[PDB]
């Protein structure tokens, strides 16, 4: 009876060719006699190609292989909140069992053409540049892309942190549950991150799913998909979850390893022919669901690594064509003092001003285009050229608006804090202030409004819009502060 069990014919590099198993489903889980788990990907006539989820030091030719009867799944539910698990959802933080409300498979269809509603609800990142220039919606998929060491994680992380403002309220639909996926990162690095999440009282609404550098390639491959299903519980049950795939560059590399060792004839740069589908089906699972489905949402921030600013590389090109917009980080900007190092020219959020707070939309009238006019203007300055009333006036303001968008790490701002500063920037009120003093203008203008004009902020945090009365009230409150 070689139907439910088989025998290892050959074993190496985390791959096992197994005789028998004549009833096994494709993509079904298997236990080896030695303990180590694995996944059947190749149902060939003579044998079965199986990729292992552990070390192959303990598999031996002839060793028995048992079916599970199960396509790879994971534990899901609110029980995961505040925990750290592996690709298969085994708890790795050493805090005991996972409290599971059920089990989703690893590979799920995306919600189709029908069960959706257009994105319209802000994910507030607390990042002045993102929220103003590339605002992100519930159900949206925004790509964070850049070379190593450019602040890619730092952009996802400030966002996760910033959800503190609603996650401590009783209101559910306002809450945003965070799922962060470490793929190919070293363990000490993931440790250091949860150590931050704890310190900002942010772990309690986060789930960490991590398959790190040392782990078997199929674990790294699988981790984003399982993390997805974990996020989908929230989406499926009328809540909101944000998921961060950090990073898909590394996931594809793993997927290539599987394929090459399984001896699936490779494609471009040795990747599988369907390496685009790998990601495309994953990121299609992030969505805003329809009313008939309880309006829940999953929002994806996948991270991608480039080499030497080559956005034109193979896997970068794929994912850019998958997502709904990109945040582009540049080392050249990082070192000019611009942090987050966001390239405004290249950065977009296709959802646009449909998922941006109306107040912030109002104050950021033409700000993204304005900055384009600024960098066009500052291009002609290099020519050692003296300018006129129109060209000096704009060069001056853009240089200040740039500086205004600089932001420290782990320090996300509230919209009621953001709206004023932008208003002060775009409406001329900063144009005659020394550039080295724009940082000090921030916390001083904030301090000033918190005491004296605290009715102004409450009106913004609760009405989310700007009536002509608020605009006049703000106009005066700023002019007032300009002369201290």
């Amino acid at each position: 009876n070689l139907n439910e069990t088989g025998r290892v014919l050959a074993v190496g590099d985390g791959i096992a060719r197994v005789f028998g198993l004549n009833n096994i489903q494709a993509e079904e889980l298997v236990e080896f006699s030695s303990g180590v788990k694995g996944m059947a990907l190749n149902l060939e006539p003579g044998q079965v190609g199986i990729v292992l989820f552990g070390s192959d030091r303990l598999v031996k030719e002839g060793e028995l292989v048992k079916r599970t009867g199960n396509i790879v799944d994971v534990p899901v539910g609110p029980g995961l909140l505040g925990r750290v698990v592996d690709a298969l959802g085994n708890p790795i933080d050493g805090k005991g069992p996972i409290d599971a409300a059920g089990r989703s498979r690893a590979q799920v269809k995306a919600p189709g053409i029908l069960p959706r509603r257009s994105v319209h609800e802000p994910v507030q990142t607390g990042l002045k540049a993102v929220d103003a220039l590339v605002p992100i919606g519930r159900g949206q998929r925004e790509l964070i892309i850049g070379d190593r060491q450019t602040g890619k994680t730092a952009v996802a992380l400030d966002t996760i942190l910033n959800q503190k403002r609603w996650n401590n309220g009783s209101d559910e639909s306002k809450k945003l549950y965070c799922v962060y996926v470490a793929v190919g990162q070293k363990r000490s690095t993931v440790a250091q991150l949860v150590q931050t999440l704890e310190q900002h009282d942010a772990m309690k609404y986060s789930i960490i799913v991590a398959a790190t550098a040392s782990e078997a390639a199929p674990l790294q491959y699988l981790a984003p998909f399982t993390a997805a299903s974990i996020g989908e519980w929230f989406r499926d049950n009328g809540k909101h979850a944000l998921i961060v795939y950090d990073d898909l560059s590394k996931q594809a590399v793993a997927y290539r390893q599987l394929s090459l060792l399984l001896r699936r004839p490779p494609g471009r740069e040795a990747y599988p022919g369907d390496v685009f589908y790998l990601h495309s089906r994953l990121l299609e699972r992030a969505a805003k669901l329809s009313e008939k489905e309880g309006s829940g949402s999953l929002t994806a921030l996948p991270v991608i690594e480039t080499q030497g600013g080559d956005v034109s590389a193979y896997i970068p090109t794929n994912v850019i064509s998958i997502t709904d917009g990109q945040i582009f980080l540049e080392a050249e900007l990082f070192y000019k003092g611009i942090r987050p190092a966001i390239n405004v020219g290249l950065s977009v959020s296709r959802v646009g001003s449909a998922a941006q707070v109306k107040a912030l939309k109002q104050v950021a009238g033409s700000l993204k285009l304005f900055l384009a006019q600024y960098r066009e203007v500052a291009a002609f300055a290099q020519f050692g050229s003296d300018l006129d009333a129109s060209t000096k006036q704009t060069l001056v303001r853009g240089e200040r608006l740039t500086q205004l968008l600089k932001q420290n790490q782990y320090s996300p701002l509230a919209t009621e804090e953001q709206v004023p500063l932008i208003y002060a920037g775009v409406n001329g009120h900063l144009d005659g202030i020394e550039l080295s003093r724009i940082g000090e203008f921030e916390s001083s203008f904030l301090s000033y409004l918190k005491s004296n004009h605290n009715e102004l902020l409450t009106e913004i945090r609760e009405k989310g819009e700007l009536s002509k009365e608020l605009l006049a009230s703000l106009k005066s409150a700023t002019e007032s502060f300009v002369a201290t």
Partner: protein, 53 residues
């Protein structure tokens, strides 16, 4: 006289600009040819790897 002095400076300025601009061109062309050759080799490797199986 200032005019005359400028035209003779602009000339000498452009003369070195052209000298450096032209010297850079040599180093970049050399880099190009390496990168051209490298693009042919690497495409050829993918195609050979693909046929290997």
């Amino acid at each position: 006289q200032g005019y005359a002095a400028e035209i003779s400076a602009r000339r000498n300025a452009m003369d070195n600009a052209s000298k450096n601009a032209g010297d850079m061109i040599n180093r970049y062309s050399i880099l190009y040819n390496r990168t051209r050759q490298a693009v042919i080799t690497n495409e050829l490797v993918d195609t050979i790897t693909g046929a290997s199986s």
